[PDB]
């Protein structure tokens, strides 16, 4: 809790309500929390994500009023929306590209957290809550891609049940449980649709905890120096209230984001998608040029980088007496990329919060930013030479950054002195 | 006193068992239903399949490959030795599970002309591309990049095992019985 | 398979202000009915859209008359009947002929330099430009490497990529030497095979361009409405952005 | 705020969490709030509602994994669940009778509030919040009844669009908008399914405000005497903590409720249902003996009681120059039964809270309980004589109780002296 | 200052228009699509409809009643006077909206033998029971208890108006054209 | 229409411990195949359930042989073929003949004293008991009010209620005086119309009871699992209720 000032009922109606349900007080204390006044444009992505989550749910609920979860009608029901429902063509492209906007946001939102050390204490809860949001989003966003029931949709669904099917021993049981039969069939589409509706509400529930988490501790800032809490007047020099200073700033950036985003949806709605999903599902034929969505490609590369001849894989195979094969190792590597990223509060031992004043950390971060982009780029490329080795170096550096580099970094760091106060950084600039 | 603290354990267990007995039905519902469980065998008419042409047929939701292999494909399979193969198991339901992954153990006839196998990549269940594709004159999987030889055996890629061979047999000269 | 080159066509619908040529879609409609419909079908396209705005925009009587030529199996009765404007085009009469409803959006005509999507970002997906290349991409004779080795029942096409290739045409390490491959579609366009209503040119390149435009409209009938709404939202949010800029600009003056 | 005692982090882990997100403190203050110690068995129905809402949502999500919102497949997809899905027969009957359990709960929960004056101040917010929940529940349960797409399902859907179709002028437009066409078709079934999925989450959100409402003010009690807040030790004499005394007592009653409820679902799952919903939808023929769900019958009776020859209707008809016809008047009466119940804090002018110490109020209240049952019973009966007038007498008393009797009662009441404190009542018991 | 307060209104107005311009697409989607808007007329073969037999046909999603009325059904309509009727409007799309609700204005022929009307109760859209039912020898609605006479006019119940009559006409001796 | 009287049958499946008689459903299956199947169908009943537990429980080979007599139009191919155990029973061969899959749960056989639901509370819904009353409710001659006035193609049944009735049989204020009404189904059961395997009695009353049980199983195949599970859930919650009481009783002991 940062030193704010309580809410005082002014009118009579406010007194009537405040003595029964202090909803106006909770809104005031929340929306007027002191926020550092030095936040740059990288602190907008939280509000954009909030809008996006409303956008997907609002448009998504509308799409459920015309979609039919059945293999014989699913692909057809989408073209019904596109052609006959008034404005239905815009709503699908909005819901489709909206997911892409919803996913460029999180990565910029996440890389902001990684750069400025917003995962280090006391903000572990905000990070872990965020990671749960990320996992729900990835599973949620995929199952939406299953619903159109195109060629890309059908064989993607076959993969995910195989990913849980790759676990030793219990995998085959789980794969049948996920599929509802020997293969992807009507039982699989019907259940994936139910979860695609459910999980966004679970995501909304997490966002409430996500919102509560940073309000209790306070927003991080580019310098990494915490707000002064010794007096109300000292905090006002380092901070301004969230409303109206930063709400309008985030809303301003939102209009610019929406300005760019609506031009995408209005003029190239299919550039961010794959044309193969406009072909009806064929259980007897897989496309030659599979490419998942751009927000799944970095995890697509990790799944393919660890083939059976990789040196690291062969070591694990003998130690486990053959249990950990290339298939299971690839699944562990893919989910392992989350685990190393989820555990980053306990791998970075440097006591300096902001990475602006960590010179050695900056290099590995920007390499990681390049690494994540490079990982995305190879996902569209064929597995042949030289792309096979490139994805392994990129995959290796990912685990090296979190499991090897960041623990080592905390000891040998030579940090730079941060400013004495947020006001010094704000006023000097 | 055994009469005292015991009650504050059995009461939780009854609630826990009640929760467990109410949660297990919610999980088991996702298992396959009766309409899919009762699928059965099929019969394929291979009367007009010349050499080099592959015939794909649906069975239990997945594709089954039926390729009449060419002159070059058959010897290419028989040239590979058991030590050169990633997987030495034939993965065949007709012959025993321990059979070796020789080219003569992957086909139905001693001439090795008719190759019948599941069109289900053992990595994650995609359909490998047929004809003569990949680096071994066989099948290439476009999902993650698995290369098979002309006999349908895995040689390179994430796939651990060879493509499985269903319970198949020729009931007459021109008809195959799948399952 | 792979992703190769294509003939770049300046289609009217391309560009932020691009719009369908109403007469062209009528021409492309004629090409589909007289040539493509013999083997292909459009199971997703409603016939009534031939009078909807942003399309051929025919009189409802012509649509009513045009629809009658198609046979339709009544969903309720079961006996066949004449086609109404409410019915869809029939299924593909030829089993292995793919449906042409979404073909103009299901194929990519351009490919990024190193799979970076830079070409698609500036040129589009390229579906209608890829169809034009397949129709006009049937050469007189095959490549010299295939003379006397063509797979029986297939035809060489420069732009098609998912086709078979003779082993005599592959190099030492398995890579095909031909630009294209052998497609199972016979050359559907022959010079002046169709006579248009408005007397427009009916060459192979012209029919491919005209039918491509109609095939694009079949896949995306609401393209002209989408760009009107898109420009509006862009113009509106620009106004909202401008006002939010000045509002945000003046608000921070009372701090620093 | 009642005088409780703060939450003190005990273990080490609790200290680590409490300095970042005080969820354990909010949970402790919430679950340990002081509750009056004189509650009888009628204070269980609030907890029973919580289980039912979870039960419907949990079972509902499962049913959505096999249902198909399409007229040609909906009814068929239900019989697929009944016959082939493992354990599907139990889950559907749970979701069906569970809604019936969910609705006997609210009425017992509501009639509890009416007797003890839990609608009078400071509990207006809790009551009005409850009314919004009731509307969502009523709307939700109907749209769920449309989904099986039986004979009752089809013509029920036709009616509700007619109710919004009964508004003068704009009604016919709204009826098309709700229907998505000239009549009930696939557009209506598909959207009713989407909203039936949405509103339960909206109901859950309202329940949070409902729960928050009574925690700020405090639970009502049979005596109506407020808790002493002059010291923590005086409150301890009047109150006990919510956990474990009333959690176990309510959980005990819940098990007894579930015992009764599972015996219904276990041995007569169709006694509370109507057989006509096992017949495929026929747009060309309506059943002769329509009977809505028992929790909709009392509002079904009000809709039919006001025919065109009622004297009161003719008065409104002439005054409005024919605008207020029988159709529009009947809809207003049906919706009016909610409005008069929602506005009861501003219609009951008696300053005595609890009806236990109001002798004349007791007579009129128990008539209302009989009135609600009579209204429920006549809804299933044929419209012929004498059921037409009985439902009209019953309908008349409903509005009389709220709009006429309760205002009048506050003047002529001869109340009895309540106890001085909650402790006094407990010691006699 | 016009530069000052204007900005604190145009920004709010743009947001208000943004909310409104973002809400209107979400509302109009629920309106009927093009597939339903383009419905058309039908033809009914009444060759084998004896007097007293009712023929129910679907049109625009709703049922249309086609009853060949008997000797008795015709008189009951013609015996009722305009003052005895709840609704004095014929509710017929063929004749003008102001036409009176006479029995000859509710049927197609001057003999009043063929009665063609929407099978849509004007209360809330249920199907009245056909044949000779109710308290007026006509149609009875089981949803809420509305009674109609043999001419299709409302006499008792919540329903305000008579059953509407679609645009109907005999195109030949043995075929009716609805719509 | 209305709701009248019925013949109370002690069906084996009635009661908390009731269970299906395996032999009885086989007889009812025989009655359905030989008589009822000519007009009616069961579009919702899978044929495979004739060997599933809690039912007729035939050998899978007999079900396989039984299923072959039905013709089925393949969903994919289109050409007709023999019926498999995976297919459902056919649609109703007679257009206006309702489907019998859920008939045993779609009709109420009992009615509360004054519509209070007390009779259903003690006797059940009465679906299978109502079917027995329709089959056995065809009298030799019609009621005296209808003698010489039967509509051609209809037959009087005591228990049927949703049928038309001649005006000559109604009372002064429009209410019908007969117990039943006129149904469009000719009497399907004739004495010894079926010959059973084990020589069991083949009277009209016996066949009606047997097919009613089969129709109850068709409507509710999982009845035997429900009552075991229901009894099970009762036992657990009963134990949970008792323990929660004793905990609640001792917990509250330290206050009053
Ligand atoms: C039968 C005489 C045909 C007529 C007339 C037309 N097409 Fe066709 N087409 C035909 C077949 C058998 C196939 C399958 C090809 C294969 O290799 O499997 C096709 C395919 C196409 C395609 C798909 C190309 C691809 O990338 O896979 C297209 C775009 C196409 N056909 C277009 C097309 C047009 C525009 C036609 C009328 C001018 C037309 N086809 C006629 C068979 C026949
Ligand atoms: C044709 C010769 C039939 C045979 C053989 C059987 N039924 Fe039938 N049935 C038939 C018709 C034309 C109708 C419609 C009746 C109507 O009034 O519209 C029916 C109806 C039924 C019903 C429904 C009763 C109700 O409450 O509506 C039942 C329960 C029924 N039939 C049962 C039944 C049984 C058990 C049969 C075999 C012993 C049987 N029917 C044979 C026509 C024919
Ligand atoms: C629906 C998704 C999300 C929404 C709406 C959201 C919203 C927000 C908001 C409003 C803030 C306050 C500061 C800001 O606006 O940047 C914030 C901060 C933050 N978020 Fe998120 N977020 C989401 C997902 C995530 C995820 C998935 C992660 C990490 C895996 C994450 C990590 C963080 C971090 C580290 C902070 C900084 C906290 C602080 O400075 O105290 N967020 N988020
Ligand atoms: C909140 C996060 C959500 C994300 C990231 C998301 C993402 C997606 C994606 C990527 C698709 C595929 C689009 C395409 O292939 O064209 C999709 C489809 C779909 N989604 Fe969602 N979705 C979300 C929430 C919801 C919700 C709450 C609903 C509620 C009903 C919903 C309903 C649908 C439907 C019906 C489709 C199929 C129709 C279509 O593709 O246009 N979605 N979603
Ligand atoms: C999902 C539906 C509902 C749930 C889960 C619920 C739950 C609860 C709970 C837990 C309480 C605290 C005391 C108690 O348990 O009785 C309560 C109190 C109350 N509820 Fe509800 N309720 C629901 C619906 C309603 C409705 C529909 C109304 C009125 C129209 C209502 C009126 C009240 C009142 C008057 C109180 C007493 C508040 C106080 O004493 O401060 N509730 N409810
Ligand atoms: C307050 C919460 C809810 C109530 C009161 C409720 C009530 C009902 C009712 C009365 C029916 C009709 C049952 C029948 O006619 O047999 C029904 C059906 C249905 N409901 Fe709900 N429901 C609720 C929440 C949900 C949720 C959250 C879902 C999905 C996630 C859902 C999914 C369904 C489905 C799929 C059906 C049709 C299948 C069936 O009838 O068994 N419901 N619901
Ligand atoms: C970053 C925001 C960019 C807005 C989208 C760019 C739109 C220009 O892009 C062009 O749009 C045309 C309109 O359909 C398409 O035909 C072209 O293929 C596409 O390249
Ligand atoms: C209030 C709780 C009552 C529990 C349900 C009563 C069950 C007795 O009721 C009887 O159950 C039998 C067994 O299922 C059914 O065969 C009968 O139809 C039903 O009437
Ligand atoms: S799915 Fe075939 S190699 Fe991965
Ligand atoms: S719906 Fe016909 S009278 Fe009410
Ligand atoms: Sr090696
Ligand atoms: Sr171009
Ligand atoms: Sr009067
Ligand atoms: Sr009985």
* A321 CA: distance to closest CA in chain D (Å): 38
Whether residue D209 and residue A23 make contact (CB cut-off 8 A), yes or no, is yes
Is residue A359 within 8 A of residue A416, CB to CB? The reply is yes
Cβ neighbors of B121 (< 8 A, separation 6 or more) are B127, B128, B141, B143, B146, B159, B163
Q: Is B144 a catalytic residue?
A: yes
D117 burial class (0-12, 13-18, 19+ CB within 10 angstroms)? buried
Is residue A285 within 8 A of residue B128, CB to CB? The reply is no
Return the structure tokens found at C240: 């909202």
CA-CA distance, E152 to E149, in Å (whole number)? Answer: 5
String of b and e for C163-186 (b: at least 16 CB within 10 Å)?
bbbbeebeeeeeebebebbbbebe
Asked whether residue C127 falls in the same domain as residue C236, the answer is: no
A402 burial class (0-12, 13-18, 19+ CB within 10 angstroms)? buried
Rounded-to-5 percentages of helix, strand, coil across chain D: 65, 0, 30
Is residue D336 within 8 A of residue D206, CB to CB? The reply is no
CA-CA distance, C224 to C55, in Å (whole number)? Answer: 9
Q: How many helices (H) and strands (E) does chain F have?
A: 7, 4
Q: Which domains does chain B have, with CATH numbers?
A: 42-178 (2.102.10.10)
Task: List the binding residues of E for [2Fe-2S] cluster.
Answer: 121, 123, 141, 144
Asked whether residue C243 falls in the same domain as residue C139, the answer is: no
CA-CA distance, C18 to A328, in Å (whole number)? Answer: 50
CA of F72: how far to CAs of D77, F43, F102, in Å? 20, 12, 21
CA-CA distance, C164 to C185, in Å (whole number)? Answer: 13
Q: Ligand 5 pocket: which of D126, D211, D247 to mutate (most atoms <8 Å of CB)?
A: D126
Q: Within 13 A of D402's CA, how many CA atoms are on the CB side?
A: 18
Please name which of C162, C158, C159 lies closest in space to residue C126, comparing C-alpha atoms.
Answer: C159
Identify how the structure was determined: X-ray
Cis peptide before C211 (omega within 30 of 0): no
How many residues appear in chain C?
A: 256
CA-CA distance, B169 to B178, in Å (whole number)? Answer: 7
Backbone torsions φ then ψ of C181, nearest 5 degrees: -160, 180
B143 among annotated binding-site residues: no
Strand B146-149 relative to strand A34-36, pairing: unpaired
- DSSP, res D242: I
Asked whether residue F235 falls in the same domain as residue F195, the answer is: no
Which residue has 């311009």 as its token pair? E21
Q: What is the DSSP string of D112-174?
A: HHHHHTTTSTT-HHHHHHHHHHHHHHHHHHHHHHHTT-BHHHHHHHHHHHHHHHTSTTTHHHH
Helical H segments across D245-296, by residue range: 247-267
String of b and e for A309-341 (b: at least 16 CB within 10 Å)?
ebeebeebbeeeeeebbbbbbbbbbbebbeebb
CA-CA distance, D243 to D254, in Å (whole number)? Answer: 15
Return the structure tokens found at C30: 């004629």
Is residue B77 within 8 A of residue B151, CB to CB? The reply is yes
CA-CA distance, A19 to A7, in Å (whole number)? Answer: 12
Domain positions in chain A are: 12-428
* F187 CA: distance to closest CA in chain E (Å): 24
Is residue C58 within 8 A of residue C225, CB to CB? The reply is no
Cβ neighbors of F27 (< 8 A, separation 6 or more) are F196, F200, F207, F210, F211, F214
CA-CA distance, C190 to C186, in Å (whole number)? Answer: 11
Please name which of F155, F128, F119, F120 lies closest in space to residue F140, comparing C-alpha atoms.
Answer: F155
Return the structure tokens found at A62: 């509308």
CA-CA distance, A194 to A74, in Å (whole number)? Answer: 14
Return the structure tokens found at A12: 């009579």
Please name which of F24, F71, F47, F34 lies closest in space to residue F206, comparing C-alpha atoms.
Answer: F24
How many residues appear in chain F?
A: 256
- DSSP, res F72: E
Is residue D177 within 8 A of residue D191, CB to CB? The reply is no
C and F adjacent (3 or more CB pairs under 8 angstroms): no
CA-CA distance, D301 to F103, in Å (whole number)? Answer: 29
CA-CA distance, A362 to A354, in Å (whole number)? Answer: 10
CATH number where F236 lies: 1.20.5.100
Cis peptide before D122 (omega within 30 of 0): yes
How many residues appear in chain E?
A: 179
SS3 E55: strand
Catalytic residues of E: 144
Whether residue C237 and residue A255 make contact (CB cut-off 8 A), yes or no, is yes
- Chain D neighbors of E36, CB-CB under 8 A: 180-182, 185, 187
Cis peptide before C115 (omega within 30 of 0): no
Asked whether residue C184 falls in the same domain as residue C211, the answer is: yes
Asked whether residue F103 falls in the same domain as residue F11, the answer is: yes
CA of F12: how far to CAs of A178, C169, F15, F208, F209, in Å? 40, 78, 8, 14, 10
- Residue C164, chain B, CB below 8 Å: the answer is yes
Return the structure tokens found at F34: 């030989």
Asked whether residue F96 falls in the same domain as residue F136, the answer is: yes
Return the structure tokens found at A23: 């909803």
Is residue B166 within 8 A of residue B126, CB to CB? The reply is no
Is residue C209 within 8 A of residue C194, CB to CB? The reply is no
The distance of Cα D296 from the centroid of its chain, to the nearest Å, equals 11
Neighbours of F121 (CB within 10 A): 12
Strand B146-149 relative to strand D239-241, pairing: unpaired
CA-CA distance, F4 to F161, in Å (whole number)? Answer: 7
CATH number where C173 lies: 1.10.760.10
Compute the C-alpha angle B35/B40/B43, nearest 5°. 140
Which residues is C72 bridged to in the sheet? Answer: C81
Count the domains in chain F.
Answer: 2
- Facing residue for B25 by CB, picked from D65, D80, D87: D87
D109 among annotated binding-site residues: yes
Return the structure tokens found at A387: 């792309």
Q: Ligand 1 pocket: which of C3, C9, C25, C40 to mutate (most atoms <8 Å of CB)?
A: C40
- Is the shortest distance between the CB of D50 and ligand 5 below 6 Å? yes
Return the structure tokens found at E25: 């697409």
Which residues is B50 bridged to in the sheet? Answer: none
CA-based nearest residue in chain A for residue B144: A304
Strand B146-149 relative to strand B154-156, pairing: antiparallel
CA of B109: how far to CAs of A287, B55, B105, D414, in Å? 32, 17, 9, 104
Is residue B62 within 8 A of residue B117, CB to CB? The reply is no
Return the structure tokens found at D59: 């079972």
Which of B62, B78, B144, B169 is flagged as catalytic?
Answer: B144
Cβ neighbors of C166 (< 8 A, separation 6 or more) are C145, C146, C149, C150, C151
SS3 F47: helix
Which residues is E146 bridged to in the sheet? Answer: E141
Beta strands in chain E (DSSP E): 42-45, 54-59, 62-68, 114-118, 129-133, 137-141, 146-149, 154-156, 168-172, 175-178
Which residues is A187 bridged to in the sheet? Answer: none
How many angstroms separate the alpha carbon of residue D130 from the centre of ligand 5?
6
CA-CA distance, A121 to A345, in Å (whole number)? Answer: 8
- DSSP, res C176: B
Please name which of F120, F99, F141, F115 lies closest in space to residue F6, comparing C-alpha atoms.
Answer: F120
Cis peptide before A244 (omega within 30 of 0): yes
Whether residue A124 and residue D20 make contact (CB cut-off 8 A), yes or no, is yes
* Torsion angle defined by CA atoms of residues B142, B148, B154 and B160, in that order, rounded to the nearest 10 degrees: 0
How many angstroms separate the alpha carbon of residue A368 from the centre of ligand 3?
20
Is residue D154 within 8 A of residue D145, CB to CB? The reply is no
Please name which of C184, C198, C177, C252 lies closest in space to residue C25, comparing C-alpha atoms.
Answer: C198
* E119 CA: distance to closest CA in chain D (Å): 8
Is residue E119 within 8 A of residue E64, CB to CB? The reply is yes
* Torsion angle defined by CA atoms of residues A129, A130, A132 and A137, in that order, rounded to the nearest 10 degrees: 150
String of b and e for D170-186 (b: at least 16 CB within 10 Å)?
ebeebbbbbbbbbbbbb
* Torsion angle defined by CA atoms of residues F170, F171, F176 and F180, in that order, rounded to the nearest 10 degrees: -80
Testing the interface with D: which of F16, F237, F245 to mutate, by most D Cβ within 10 A?
A: F237
Whether residue B28 and residue D62 make contact (CB cut-off 8 A), yes or no, is no
A12-428: CATH, from 1.20.810.10, 3.20.20.210, 3.40.50.620, 1.10.10.10: 1.20.810.10
CA-CA distance, C194 to C212, in Å (whole number)? Answer: 15
- Chain F neighbors of B21, CB-CB under 8 A: 233, 236
CA-CA distance, D402 to D344, in Å (whole number)? Answer: 6
Helical H segments across B29-158, by residue range: 34-37, 71-79
How many angstroms separate the alpha carbon of residue C40 from the centre of ligand 1?
7
CA-CA distance, C47 to A260, in Å (whole number)? Answer: 36
Helical H segments across D180-246, by residue range: 186-217, 232-238
Asked whether residue F63 falls in the same domain as residue F23, the answer is: yes
Asked whether residue C232 falls in the same domain as residue C155, the answer is: no
- Facing residue for F164 by CB, picked from E131, E134, E135: E131
Task: Pick the residue whose CA is nearest to atom 17 on ligand 2.
Answer: F183
Is residue F127 within 8 A of residue F9, CB to CB? The reply is no
Cβ neighbors of A96 (< 8 A, separation 6 or more) are A269, A273
Note down the domain range covering F212.
1-221
Whether residue C48 and residue E10 make contact (CB cut-off 8 A), yes or no, is no
Please name which of F36, F10, F39, F7 lies closest in space to residue F218, comparing C-alpha atoms.
Answer: F36
- Facing residue for D216 by CB, picked from A20, A124, A213: A20
Asked whether residue F208 falls in the same domain as residue F251, the answer is: no
B147 among annotated binding-site residues: no
Asked whether residue F126 falls in the same domain as residue F247, the answer is: no
Cβ neighbors of D355 (< 8 A, separation 6 or more) are D114, D115, D116, D117, D361, D362, D365
Which residues, numbered 11 to 70 in chain B, qualify as contacts with chain C under a Cβ-Cβ cut-off of 8 Å?
none
Radius of gyration of chain C (CA): 23
Chains that touch D (3 or more CB pairs under 8 A): A, B, E, F
SS3 C202: coil
Asked whether residue F209 falls in the same domain as residue F254, the answer is: no
Neighbours of E174 (CB within 10 A): 12
Identify the H or E element spanning D240: strand D239-241
Q: Ligand 8 pocket: which of F6, F9, F12, F14 to mutate (most atoms <8 Å of CB)?
A: F14
CA-CA distance, B105 to B89, in Å (whole number)? Answer: 10
């Amino acid at each position: 809790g940062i030193p704010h000032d309580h809410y005082e009922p002014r009118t009579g109606i406010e007194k009537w309500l405040h003595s029964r349900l202090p909803i106006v007080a909770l809104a005031y204390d929340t929306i007027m929390i002191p926020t550092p006044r030095n936040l740059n444009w990288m602190w907008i992505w939280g509000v954009v994500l909030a809008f996006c989550l409303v956008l997907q749910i609002v448009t998504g609920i509308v799409l459920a009023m015309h979609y039919t979860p059945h293999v014989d009608l699913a692909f057809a029901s989408v073209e019904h929306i596109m052609r006959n429902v008034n404005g239905g063509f815009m709503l699908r492209y909005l819901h489709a590209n909206g997911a892409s906007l919803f996913f460029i946001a999180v990565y910029l939102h996440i890389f902001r957290g990684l750069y400025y050390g917003s995962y280090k204490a006391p903000r572990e809860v905000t990070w872990i809550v965020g990671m749960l949001i990320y996992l729900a989003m990835m599973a949620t966003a995929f199952m939406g891609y299953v619903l159109p029931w195109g060629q890309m949709s059908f064989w993607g669904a076959t993969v995910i049940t195989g990913l849980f099917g790759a676990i030793p021993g219990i995998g085959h049981s789980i794969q049948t449980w996920l599929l509802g039969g020997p293969a992807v069939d009507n039982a699989t589409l019907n259940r994936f649709f139910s979860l695609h509706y459910l999980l966004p509400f679970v995501i909304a529930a997490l966002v409430a905890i996500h919102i509560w988490a940073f309000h209790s501790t306070g927003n991080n800032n580019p310098t990494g120096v915490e707000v002064r809490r010794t007096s109300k007047a000292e905090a006002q020099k380092d901070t301004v209230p969230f409303w109206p200073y930063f709400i309008i700033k985030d809303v301003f950036a939102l209009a610019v984001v929406l300005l760019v985003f609506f031009a995408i949806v209005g003029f190239m709605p299919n550039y961010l998608g794959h044309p193969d999903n406009y072909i009806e599902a064929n259980p007897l034929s897989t496309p030659a040029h599979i490419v998942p969505e751009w927000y799944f490609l970095p995890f697509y590369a990790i799944l393919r980088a660890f083939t059976a001849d990789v040196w690291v894989v062969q070591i694990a195979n003998f130690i486990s007496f053959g249990i950990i094969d290339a298939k299971f190792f690839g699944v562990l590597a893919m989910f392992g990329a989350i685990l190393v990223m989820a555990l980053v509060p306990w791998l970075d031992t440097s006591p300096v919060r902001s990475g602006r004043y960590r010179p050695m950390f900056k290099i590995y971060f920007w390499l990681l930013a390049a690494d994540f982009v490079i990982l995305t780029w190879v996902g569209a490329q064929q597995t042949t030479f030289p792309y096979d080795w490139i994805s392994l170096i990129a995959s290796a550096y990912w685990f090296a950054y979190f499991l090897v580099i960041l623990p080592i970094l905390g000891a040998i760091e030579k940090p730079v002195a941060p400013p004495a106060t947020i006001e010094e950084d704000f006023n000097a600039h | 006193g055994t009469r005292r603290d015991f009650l504050y354990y059995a009461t939780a267990g009854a609630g826990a068992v009640a929760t467990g007995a109410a949660v297990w039905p919610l999980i088991n519902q996702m298992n396959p239903s009766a309409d899919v469980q009762a699928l059965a065998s099929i019969f394929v008419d291979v009367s007009s399949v010349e050499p080099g042409v592959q015939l794909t047929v649906k069975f239990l939701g997945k594709p089954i490959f039926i390729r009449r292999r060419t002159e070059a494909d058959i010897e290419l399979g028989r040239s590979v030795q058991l030590g050169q193969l990633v997987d030495t198991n034939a993965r065949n339901a007709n012959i025993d599970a321990g059979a070796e992954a020789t080219d003569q153990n992957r086909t139905l006839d001693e001439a090795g002309e008719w190759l019948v196998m599941w069109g289900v990549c053992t990595h994650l269940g995609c359909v490998p591309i047929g004809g003569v594709s990949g680096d071994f004159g066989g099948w290439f999987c476009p999902c993650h990049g698995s290369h098979y030889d002309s006999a349908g055996r895995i040689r390179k890629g994430p796939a651990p095992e060879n493509l499985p061979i269903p319970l198949a047999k020729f009931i007459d000269e021109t008809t195959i019985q799948l399952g | 398979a792979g992703g190769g080159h294509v003939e770049d066509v300046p289609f009217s619908f391309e560009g932020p202000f691009g719009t369908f040529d109403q007469h062209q879609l009528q021409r492309g409609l004629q090409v589909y009915t007289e040539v493509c419909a013999a083997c292909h079908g459009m199971k997703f396209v409603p016939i009534r859209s031939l009078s909807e705005p942003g399309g051929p925009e025919l009189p409802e009587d012509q649509v009513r008359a045009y629809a009658t030529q198609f046979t339709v199996t009544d969903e309720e009765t079961g006996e066949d009947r004449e086609g109404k404007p409410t019915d869809h085009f029939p299924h593909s009469a030829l089993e292995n002929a793919p449906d042409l409803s979404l073909m103009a959006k299901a194929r990519a005509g351009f490919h990024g330099p190193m799979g970076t999507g830079i070409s698609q970002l500036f040129n589009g997906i390229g579906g209608p430009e890829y169809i034009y290349s397949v129709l006009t991409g049937f050469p007189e004779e095959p490549p010299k490497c295939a003379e006397g080795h063509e797979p029986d029942g297939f035809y060489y096409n420069r732009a098609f990529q998912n086709g078979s290739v003779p082993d005599t045409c592959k190099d030492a390490n398995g890579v095909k030497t031909t630009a294209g491959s052998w497609i199972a579609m016979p050359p559907p366009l022959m010079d002046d095979l169709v006579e248009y209503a408005d007397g427009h040119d009916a060459s192979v390149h012209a029919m491919a361009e005209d039918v491509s435009a109609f095939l694009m409209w079949a896949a995306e009938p609401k393209l002209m409405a989408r760009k009107q709404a898109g420009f509006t939202a862009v113009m509106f949010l620009t106004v909202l952005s401008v006002l939010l800029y000045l509002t945000n600009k003046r608000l921070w003056a009372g701090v620093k």
